[PDB]
Amino acid sequence: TTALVCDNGSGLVKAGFAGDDAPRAVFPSIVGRPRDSYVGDEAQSKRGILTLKYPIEHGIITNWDDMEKIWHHTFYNELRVAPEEHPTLLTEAPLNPKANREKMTQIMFETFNVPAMYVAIQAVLSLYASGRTTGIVLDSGDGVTHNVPIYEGYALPHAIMRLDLAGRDLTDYLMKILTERGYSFVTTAEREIVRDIKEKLCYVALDFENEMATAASSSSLEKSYELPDGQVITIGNERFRCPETLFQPSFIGMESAGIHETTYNSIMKCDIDIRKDLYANNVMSGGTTMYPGIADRMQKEITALAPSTMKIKIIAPPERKYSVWIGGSILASLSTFQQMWITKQEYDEAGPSIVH
Amino acid sequence: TALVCDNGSGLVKAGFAGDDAPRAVFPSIVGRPRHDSYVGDEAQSKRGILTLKYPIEHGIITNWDDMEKIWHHTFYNELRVAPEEHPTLLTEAPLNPKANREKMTQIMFETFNVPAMYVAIQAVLSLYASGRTTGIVLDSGDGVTHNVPIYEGYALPHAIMRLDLAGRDLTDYLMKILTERGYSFVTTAEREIVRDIKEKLCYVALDFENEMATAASSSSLEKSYELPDGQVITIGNERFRCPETLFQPSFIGMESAGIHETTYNSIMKCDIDIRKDLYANNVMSGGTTMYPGIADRMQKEITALAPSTMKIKIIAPPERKYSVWIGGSILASLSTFQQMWITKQEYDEAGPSIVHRKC
Ligand SMILES: Nc1ncnc2c1ncn2[C@@H]1O[C@H](COP(=O)(O)OP(=O)(O)OP(=O)(O)O)[C@@H](O)[C@H]1O
Ligand SMILES: Nc1ncnc2c1ncn2[C@@H]1O[C@H](COP(=O)(O)OP(=O)(O)OP(=O)(O)O)[C@@H](O)[C@H]1O
Ligand SMILES: [Mg+2]
Ligand SMILES: [Mg+2]
Ligand SMILES: [Mg+2]
């Protein structure tokens, strides 16, 4: 019998079968209804006759009717399974309210009649996918970024840091600067183009100052991109100014700490006796950590903040866009996990509170 | 902390269980005086006043004196540990003679007085490093290439294929063909240069017909390399011709079939009911699998050879140069492995024969 793994992203659902090395289904977490309903790419394609909503905002489910349609679509149309036949592992964001985890549980057992389920914190699964149970994850996704330090398999909630900036902000920022360069990217189709430029051409500079100087004195950092209208746009410093925002949130008018500071602060909130292990096990996950150079830059920044003898290591797996999903797939596949599933029988006896 | 030591024909990879990479990587060479012993790079630096010796030829320990010096240097000079304080995992080749393993465990207990040790097959550790216990491994290293099908943790000796050709043989051939086009590569220090070129510019072309026909009518494949003597050369079609040898060994006057065929054939020597699992879990490891494009090229050749609907997957991890060592580091770190070491006590109550039953 096959378990399902569903990572409920703000932007993209990743779904599939435990034991597979990648999610079978990856699709927009959007539900469209006429101005019954559509989900995912079909909703987006038919946007001109639908009202589109995003039931997950900074990783928290905020519209349960629409979330039910995402999950229905996931089981029946993407995976082509009957959920009553499969143990189902779901993910949640760090700091997810208790009542939310209970509602997810109630829906899974009473609406979808799953035989068993489990809910895990996204960043914890990413740590597992890197082969670790102790470490600190930076998970940067669509609309939010978290640091989650983890000890012997469990997140340490008191030390979690949340930064209200992630990939969508970086896309908006690049849209703004390319607009000012004299192109128009405002609409939804044109937003997708900018997102694509960001994902293909952007990188994190090891030394932002030096890189700005290099961009000012030669064309060595330029790359070009053909837009759908046939115009070819060339960018230079835009490539690294855009993700520099992660380190300097002032670039988009935010007073927040950057991701290097939230990482350090999160480690410093943890027990002094585990910090050596945290510093040596910083794992990066989520789409907004995909920038070339991000790991070397974090290494440099954390080294400047940490005690001078401290061993610092940043792990940025090639698969880190899907590491949350992968961690779920590994976990749900282990013979030692099979006693940890919450069963329908247990739910019938104890109600939604069992999930904690 | 346990130690892991992968005894390579060309390179020793050594370090601490739990690390994600070996601390020490050095040549498997022991120089005595020509007319008092040195190992690794210092033997290479003193090669002029020392007889160099390679104690490991195609993965099989051949000269136990020299191997003792390799291990002695590994503990005391490279890792700077006292062997008596660490359980020690060694690797061995596929089909290591049974007596070979023993003498390996004797030396470990009697000369270095390790508290515990274990001996694992290199290809099997590479499978573990990919997170699997079922798959077929292609391990191409310095002195040998090997296919080892593995099922539920058990390597399958009957289906193993041993291609007598690897990294040294591609290094040797690249010196032969480079000096033909114009340049000059024949000597010991010029050998270190062409193995540098091998590891930086060589690649496996997807269609060998289309890329040899591309080079002779278009300069799109040329790259420029800086010599230590202080100059610039340009290597063209021999980037991909060098490692093409792996898929068709007739290039160096050698009879037996390529790595794509030894891979197919290894699968066919296995039980028909597991071939499914082998085809979809083909793991590549060892320095000589590092060529870019080798996974795509292997993928092409075996989908053509295997049944049309068979699901086929080549796994070539970016870390595959040290996959054997990494698999050891994983294994020796597992709490579930700790009961499985052979202790100094068990060795003193049974003999060297305990390595056959406990490993
Ligand atoms: N190669 C890449 N380089 C830079 N950004 C990328 C890359 N690939 C994807 N992204 C960005 O990652 C973001 C989406 O991240 P991700 O899929 O991890 O979020 P999610 O899991 O859907 O949402 P959540 O924030 O709820 O975890 C988008 O902004 C997207 O543009
Ligand atoms: N990046 C590279 N590209 C191609 N070949 C490489 C690369 N790096 C190393 N090699 C080659 O791989 C060989 C060494 O690999 P490896 O450490 O796996 O052999 P070994 O384990 O020492 O020997 P063996 O397992 O055959 O007994 C050398 O010939 C080396 O030149
Ligand atoms: Mg996410
Ligand atoms: Mg327009
Ligand atoms: Mg080897």
In Å, how far are A309, B144, B176, B225, B289 from B202, measured between CA atoms? Answer: 39, 19, 15, 12, 11
Sign of CA dihedral A201, A286, A73, B311: positive
Chain B's closest residue to A330, CA to CA, is B131
Is residue B286 within 6 Å of ligand 2 at its C-beta?
yes
Q: What is the DSSP string of B287-336?
A: GGG-STTHHHHHHHHHHHHS-TT----EE--TTGGGHHHHHHHHHHH-GG
How many whole angstroms separate alpha carbon A37 and alpha carbon A164?
A: 30
User: Which residues are CB-contacts of B308 (< 8 A; sequence separation ≥ 6)?
Assistant: none
Nearest CA residue ID for atom 22, ligand 2: B8
The helix (H) or strand (E) run that includes residue A125 is helix A122-129
Experimental technique used to determine this entry: X-ray
- State the distance from the centre of ligand 5 to the C-alpha of B195, rounded, in angstroms: 17
Tokens of B17: 């269980």
The answer to whether the CB of B285 is under 6 A from ligand 2 is no
Resolution in A: 2.0
The radius of gyration of chain A from alpha carbons, rounded to an integer in Å, stands at 21
Of B320, B285, B325, residue with least CA distance to B25: B325
Distances (CA, A) of B231 to B184, B192, B194, B228: 13, 16, 14, 7
**β-strands B3-7, A135-140 pairing:** unpaired
CATH code linked to domain A165-256: 3.90.640.10
- The Cα–Cα gap between B138 and B263 comes to 7
B330 contact residues in A (CB cutoff 8 A): 131
Distance from CA of B148 to the nearest CA of A (A): 23
Buried b (16+ CB within 10 A) or exposed e, A21-42: eebebbbbbbbbbeeeebbbeb
Tell me if A1-122+324-356 shares its fold with A123-164+257-323. yes
Residue of minimum CA distance from atom 11 in ligand 1: A287
Backbone phi and psi for residue B56, each to the nearest 5 degrees, phi listed first: -120, 115
Structure tokens at B1: 């902390």
> Measured between beta carbons, which residues in chain A are less than 8 angstroms from residue B318?
318
**CB-based contacts of B9, cutoff 8 Å, min separation 6:** B28, B54, B56, B57, B58, B59, B141, B142, B143, B144, B166, B168
Cβ(B243) – ligand 2 distance below 6 Å: no
Residue owning the nearest CA to atom 20 of ligand 2: B8
CA distance linking residue B65 with residue B62, whole number of Å? 9
Phi, psi of A319 (to 5 degrees): -90, 15
All residues of chain B having their beta carbon less than 8 Å from the beta carbon of residue A130 are none
Q: What is the C-alpha R_g of chain B?
A: 21
Residues 6+ apart with CB under 8 A from A309: none
- Residue of B7, B321, B325, B326 to test ligand 2 pocket, by largest number of atoms within 8 Å of CB: B321
Spatial separation of the C-alpha atoms in residues A308 and B68, rounded to whole Å: 39
Q: Which CATH architecture has domain B1-122+324-359?
A: 2-Layer Sandwich (3.30)
Amino acid B292 reads: P
Question: What whole-number distance in Å separates Cα of residue B82 and Cα of residue A212?
Answer: 51
What is the C-alpha separation between B29 and B41, in angstroms, rounded?
8
Give the mutation target among B288, B294, B319 for probing the ligand 2 site: most ligand atoms within 8 A of CB. B288
Fold of A1-122+324-356: Nucleotidyltransferase; domain 5 (3.30.420)
Ligand nearest to the CA of B242: 2
Residue B350, classified by CB atoms within 10 Å of its CB into exposed (0-12), middle (13-18) or buried (19+), is middle
> What angle is formed at CA A149 by the lines to CA A148 and CA A151, rounded to 5 degrees?
135
- Give me the DSSP letters along A38-64: EETHHHHHTGGGEEEE-SEETTEE--H
B9 Cα–ligand 2 center, Å = 9
Please work out whether the CB of residue B55 comes within 6 Å of at least one atom of ligand 2: no
- For B356, the enclosing helix (H) or strand (E) is helix B354-358
What are the residues whose beta carbon lies below 5 Å from ligand 3 (ion)? A 9, 141
Whether B22 lines ligand 2, by a CB cut-off of 6 Å, is: no
The best mutation among B5, B7, B11 to test binding of ligand 2, ranked by most ligand atoms within 8 Å of the C-beta, falls on B11
Sequence-separated (6 or more) residues with CB below 8 Å from residue A267 = A136, A149, A159, A275, A278, A279
| Closest among B249, B58, B267 to B148, alpha carbons compared | B267
What are the chain A neighbours of B132 within 8 Å (beta carbons)?
none
Ligand nearest to the CA of A187: 4
Q: Which residues pair with A27 in a beta bridge?
A: A13
Distance between CA atoms of residues A324 and A127, nearest Å: 8
Instruction: Describe the strand order of the beta sheet including A50-53 as a list of residue ranges.
Output: A38-39, A31-34, A50-53
Indicate which ligand has the atom closest to the C-alpha of B144: 2
Nearest to B147 by CA among B44, B246, B5: B246
User: Which of B331, B321, B13, B333 lies closest to B141, judged by CA?
Assistant: B321
**Alpha carbon distance A341, A355 (integer Å):** 10
A224 burial (CB, 10 Å; 0-12 / 13-18 / 19+) is: exposed
Residue nearest to atom 2 of ligand 2 (CA): B199
Into which CATH architecture does domain A123-164+257-323 fall? 2-Layer Sandwich (3.30)
- Supply the DSSP string of B119-178, one letter for each residue: EEEHHHHHHHHTT-SSEEEEEE-SS-EEEEEEETTEE-GGG-EEES--HHHHHHHHHHHH
For chains A and B, what is the number of CB pairs under 8 angstroms? 3
- Ligand 1 pocket mutation, candidates A30, A67, A121, A142, criterion most atoms within 8 A of CB: A142
Q: Is the CB of B249 under 6 A from ligand 2?
A: no
| Cβ-contact A187, A266 below 8 angstroms | no
Answer for the pair B7, B57: CB distance below 8 angstroms, yes or no: no
Point out the residue among B131, B318, B330 whose CB comes nearest to the CB of A318: B318
**How many angstroms separate the CA of residue B260 from the nearest CA in chain A?**
24
Cα of B283 to ligand 1 centre, how many Å?
Answer: 30
Backbone angles phi, psi at A17, to 5 degrees: -110, 135
Question: For residue B317, what are its two tokens?
Answer: 């991890």
Cβ of B288 less than 6 Å from ligand 2 = yes
Q: What is the DSSP string of B236-250?
A: -THHHHHHHTTT-GG
Question: Phi, psi at residue A50, to the nearest 5°?
Answer: -130, 160
CB of B143 sitting under 6 A from ligand 2: yes
Q: Hey, where are the domains in chain B?
A: 1-122+324-359, 123-164+257-323, 165-256
As a dihedral over the C-alpha atoms of residue A294, residue A295, residue A296, residue A300, rounded to 10 degrees, the angle is: 100
Long-range CB contacts for residues B266-275, cutoff 8 Å, separation at least 24:
B266/B136, B266/B147, B266/B148, B266/B149, B266/B159, B266/B160, B266/B161, B267/B136, B267/B149, B267/B159, B267/B306, B269/B149, B269/B156, B269/B158, B269/B159, B270/B149, B270/B151, B270/B156, B270/B159, B271/B151, B274/B134, B274/B151, B275/B310
Beta bridge pairs of residue B188: none
| Disruptive mutation site among B20, B277, B320, B331 for chain A (greatest number of A CBs within 10 Å) | B20
B149 lines ligand 2 (CB under 6 A): no
Q: Which residues pair with B3 in a beta bridge?
A: B16, B88
Nearest residue (CA) to ligand 2, atom 9: B287
Other beta carbons less than 10 A from residue B218's beta carbon: 9
How far is ligand 1, taken at its centre, from the CA of residue B85, in Å? 47
CA–chain centroid gap for B138, Å, is 10
Calpha distance B227→B211 (Å, rounded): 26
User: Which tokens hold the place of B114?
Assistant: 């390790």
Number of residues assigned to chain A: 356
CA of B258 to the centre of ligand 2 (A): 18
**Lining residues, ligand 1, CB within 6 Å:** A 9-12, 59, 141-144, 166-168, 171, 195, 198-199, 286-288, 290-291, 321
Q: Report yes or no: A179 and A255 within 8 Å, Cβ to Cβ.
A: no
Residues present in chain B in total:
359
